[PDB]
């Protein structure tokens, strides 16, 4: 998420048992780090190994 230049990152790691490609239920995502960058962003991309 982009907060007026401050880019924030939230995360959560939990085990699952994949049955239908997307486990449902409920969870809460904790924060990871704040990033005072201040650069406009409009798109993104993944980096696969």
């Amino acid at each position: 998420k982009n907060i007026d230049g401050y880019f924030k990152i939230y995360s959560k790691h939990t085990p699952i048992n994949l049955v239908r490609d997307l486990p449902q239920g409920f969870s809460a995502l904790e924060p990871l780090v704040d990033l005072p960058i201040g650069i406009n962003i409009t798109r993104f991309q993944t980096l696969l190994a």
Partner: protein, 49 residues
């Protein structure tokens, strides 16, 4: 004639005077842009009452 090599070396010898001795100079410039702050000074602290 009407031509000159613009760069020249310094005469920093140990016998130089106050007006010719070497001086390690650093110019600290500050910048206030629309982007947020990045480096703020040390704040005071006291014991916990």
């Amino acid at each position: 004639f009407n031509c000159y090599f613009p760069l020249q070396s310094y005469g920093f010898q140990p016998t130089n005077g106050v007006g010719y001795q070497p001086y390690r100079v650093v110019v600290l410039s500050f910048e206030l842009l629309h982007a947020p702050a990045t480096v703020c000074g040390p704040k005071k602290s006291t014991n916990l009452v």
